[PDB]
RNA sequence: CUUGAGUCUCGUAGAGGGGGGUAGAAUUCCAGGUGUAGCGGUGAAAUGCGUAGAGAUCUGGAGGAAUACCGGUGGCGAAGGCGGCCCCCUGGACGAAGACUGACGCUCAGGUGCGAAAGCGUGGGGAGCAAACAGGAUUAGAUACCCUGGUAGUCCACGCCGUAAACGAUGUCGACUUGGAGGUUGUGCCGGCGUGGCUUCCGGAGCUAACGCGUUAAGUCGACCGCCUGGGGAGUACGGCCGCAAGGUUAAAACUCAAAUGAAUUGACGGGGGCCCGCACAAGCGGUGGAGCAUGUGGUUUAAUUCGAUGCAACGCGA
């Protein structure tokens, strides 16, 4: 568990941390879950987002087969 | 059955042999309770087998047997309305017990005259792979191969 | 599920590390999933059972720990 | 003919058959062999199996380019996944990784009715 | 007058709505490369596809639709509904301090608006899916379920339709009345202690025919509205209004029955589930069914062929 950005005292996520985004995708790219991170929901949407515009500006992959 | 109580039956050893295998081959080939006769007609068989392999009794007995004795069949298994013929294998005394009743059951059919000669032409058949009791065993491991797929069932 | 079979890795290894892989990533899942259509209703539907059933078995279970069965 | 020495296995594995291509790197086929072309029809055709039979014989079929070395990529839920690829190991291919290319669309198409059976 | 109702200030979460753009995955199709005898499909098949080179695999292209994971008895909306990402326009909700207006409120026949899916009109679009339809199976038949194909439609714009088990089968608004465990979203103070909004489960009194409901009431009350009056005939007929149509809406009667119905209880049953057992299967051995004959029965015959037993549990049975 261990919700981060609470601790952390984030107001966003930002979608350009490629280092924090790659703790919450699989091997595969896929996002992770909340209940297995232990991440709030609301800064489980946050990271959703991240991440979904991470991966349009091709600083994240969608899979690992592309 | 659903218990599972089951347990061998104590079994006399031939008496001119001593081989617990050889008085289940008279038991198979009995009838009626009629053992003197079932034991005149397996020695003089055997006798007759010795001779003409010049081995001994007991060994021809048990070349003959090795040639028979399966090593796999089948079981079926209904799935879809459908059987499946699930290979499984054979446990050792049931392979003596198939390879002893298929040459009784080889010699019964065969068209010479006393019962003793035709087993005996049976025995000397299956030493070389040719009576139809061996015949039988290769029926039963070519099924078994058609269905090696279906080995999980 | 990409697996690159290390040095000195016998294959049966090599092997379960991939089945972990797929296992994990859900693949056979999602195609047993996606092989037909549900419709939205019936995936509400199963959703919801889902997660009735689970409370209720949790539910039981701790109340069965309270109970003794002999 | 032409020694390649370095190819893929294609594991096409889907609930009534298995296809097992064996290409270059770059795509061109090899040789190929099925479940379905191996001597098994039916209920017999789409077990792990005939799959294996099916992996041997494509494995003998591009014995004359002289491969070694294989990836594995493996596609569709069959029961041929797995019997697939280790009869391609013990062909004697070095089999130097193995890929998931199940393709799964991120949404994509409606599927086909539910079956009523 | 300020306590209900409302305005303002600062923030907060949100698949709320409308418009535009765009991304990646996948399907299909087209062109080509490699390659060669199968593919596909089912319970099993066959239709179908394939040596005119399919299927598999690689490359490039076209096009439509939907947005995996996140994702959650999570969130938002009056309901219907709403899910990738980005922008533009826009509605509501909530919280903390105040300030302001000063009963401006609640409900609502008629009216008006919104209103899933299917359907309808005009013009587009059409990948996938698929009523109809065709063929292959299955079957006694099989106008089905299964298979191979496949057109409306599903998509877009605009208009119509106005109905759904449109459901919490629970009208709206307000007040009051023991608890417990969560979710989500604010906020105050020092991970602890409070304090708001929405929400899931359990349960107390009470209520209820019972099942159950239980501070989100089906409890205790007040305001207003809608609706019911045995089953069938029938939400039908006729008339009116509405609709392009399909139809919607309002809505009877004759006749007929002595029930229809709700919840719960004990069985029985299930091609429901679980656990067991039996020569019940399985593993075996020997038979019956064919022949002749014995014997009993049915039937037929007869003057009479005495009466009885006559699925298992009558038929070498009373005898
Ligand atoms: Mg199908
Ligand atoms: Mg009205
Ligand atoms: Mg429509
Ligand atoms: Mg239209
Ligand atoms: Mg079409
Ligand atoms: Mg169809
Ligand atoms: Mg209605
Ligand atoms: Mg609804
Ligand atoms: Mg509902
Ligand atoms: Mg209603
Ligand atoms: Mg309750
Ligand atoms: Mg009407
Ligand atoms: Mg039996
Ligand atoms: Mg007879
Ligand atoms: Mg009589
Ligand atoms: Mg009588
Ligand atoms: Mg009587
Ligand atoms: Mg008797």
């Given at each position: 568990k261990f919700c981060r950005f609470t601790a952390e005292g984030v107001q966003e996520i930002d979608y350009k941390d490629i280092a924090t985004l790659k703790n919450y995708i699989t091997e595969s790219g896929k996002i992770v879950p909340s209940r297995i991170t232990g991440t709030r929901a609301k800064y489980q949407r946050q990271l959703a987002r991240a991440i979904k515009r991470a991966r349009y500006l091709s600083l994240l992959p969608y899979t690992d087969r592309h | 059955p659903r218990r599972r109580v089951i347990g061998q039956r104590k079994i006399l050893p031939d008496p001119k042999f001593g081989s617990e295998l050889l008085a289940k081959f008279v038991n198979i080939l009995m009838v009626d309770g009629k053992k003197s006769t079932a034991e005149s007609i397996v020695y003089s068989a055997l006798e007759t087998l010795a001779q003409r392999s010049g081995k001994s009794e007991l060994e021809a007995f048990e070349v003959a047997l090795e040639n028979v004795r399966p090593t796999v069949e089948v079981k079926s298994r209904r799935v879809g309305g459908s059987t499946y013929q699930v290979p499984v294998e054979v446990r050792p005394v049931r392979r003596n017990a198939l390879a002893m009743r298929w040459i009784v059951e080889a010699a019964r059919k065969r068209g010479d005259k006393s019962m003793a000669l035709r087993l005996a032409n049976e025995l000397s058949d299956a030493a070389e792979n040719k009576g139809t009791a061996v015949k039988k065993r290769e029926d039963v491991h070519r099924m078994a191969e058609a269905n090696k797929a279906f080995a999980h069932y | 599920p990409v697996i690159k079979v290390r040095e000195n890795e016998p294959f049966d290894v090599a092997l379960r590390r991939f089945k972990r892989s797929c296992e994990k990533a859900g693949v056979l899942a999602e195609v047993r999933r996606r092989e037909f259509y549900e419709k939205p209703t019936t995936e509400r539907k199963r959703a919801k059972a889902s997660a009735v059933k689970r409370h209720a078995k949790k539910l039981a279970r701790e109340n069965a720990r309270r109970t003794r069965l002999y | 003919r032409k020694q390649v020495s370095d190819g893929v296995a294609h594991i096409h594995a889907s609930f009534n058959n298995t296809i097992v291509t064996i290409t270059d790197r770059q795509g061109n086929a090899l040789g190929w062999a099925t479940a379905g072309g191996s001597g098994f029809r039916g209920s017999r055709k789409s077990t792990p199996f005939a799959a294996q039979v099916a992996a041997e014989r494509c494995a003998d079929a591009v014995k004359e380019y002289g491969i070694k070395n294989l990836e594995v990529m493996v596609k569709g839920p069959g029961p041929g996944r797995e019997s697939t690829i280790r009869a391609l190991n013990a062909?004697?291919?070095?089999?130097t990784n193995i890929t998931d290319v199940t393709p799964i669309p991120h949404x994509g198409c409606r599927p086909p009715k539910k079956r009523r059976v």
């Amino acid at each position: 568990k261990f919700c981060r950005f609470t601790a952390e005292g984030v107001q966003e996520i930002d979608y350009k941390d490629i280092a924090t985004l790659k703790n919450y995708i699989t091997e595969s790219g896929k996002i992770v879950p909340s209940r297995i991170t232990g991440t709030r929901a609301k800064y489980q949407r946050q990271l959703a987002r991240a991440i979904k515009r991470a991966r349009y500006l091709s600083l994240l992959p969608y899979t690992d087969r592309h | 059955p659903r218990r599972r109580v089951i347990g061998q039956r104590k079994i006399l050893p031939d008496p001119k042999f001593g081989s617990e295998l050889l008085a289940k081959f008279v038991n198979i080939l009995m009838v009626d309770g009629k053992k003197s006769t079932a034991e005149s007609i397996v020695y003089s068989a055997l006798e007759t087998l010795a001779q003409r392999s010049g081995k001994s009794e007991l060994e021809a007995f048990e070349v003959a047997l090795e040639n028979v004795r399966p090593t796999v069949e089948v079981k079926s298994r209904r799935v879809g309305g459908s059987t499946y013929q699930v290979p499984v294998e054979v446990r050792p005394v049931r392979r003596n017990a198939l390879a002893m009743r298929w040459i009784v059951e080889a010699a019964r059919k065969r068209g010479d005259k006393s019962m003793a000669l035709r087993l005996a032409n049976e025995l000397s058949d299956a030493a070389e792979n040719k009576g139809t009791a061996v015949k039988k065993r290769e029926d039963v491991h070519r099924m078994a191969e058609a269905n090696k797929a279906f080995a999980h069932y | 599920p990409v697996i690159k079979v290390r040095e000195n890795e016998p294959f049966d290894v090599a092997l379960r590390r991939f089945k972990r892989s797929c296992e994990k990533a859900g693949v056979l899942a999602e195609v047993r999933r996606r092989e037909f259509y549900e419709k939205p209703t019936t995936e509400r539907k199963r959703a919801k059972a889902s997660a009735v059933k689970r409370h209720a078995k949790k539910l039981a279970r701790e109340n069965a720990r309270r109970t003794r069965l002999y | 003919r032409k020694q390649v020495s370095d190819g893929v296995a294609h594991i096409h594995a889907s609930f009534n058959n298995t296809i097992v291509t064996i290409t270059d790197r770059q795509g061109n086929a090899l040789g190929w062999a099925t479940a379905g072309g191996s001597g098994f029809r039916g209920s017999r055709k789409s077990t792990p199996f005939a799959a294996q039979v099916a992996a041997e014989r494509c494995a003998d079929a591009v014995k004359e380019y002289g491969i070694k070395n294989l990836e594995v990529m493996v596609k569709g839920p069959g029961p041929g996944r797995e019997s697939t690829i280790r009869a391609l190991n013990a062909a004697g291919f070095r089999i130097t990784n193995i890929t998931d290319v199940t393709p799964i669309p991120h949404x994509g198409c409606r599927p086909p009715k539910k079956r009523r059976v």
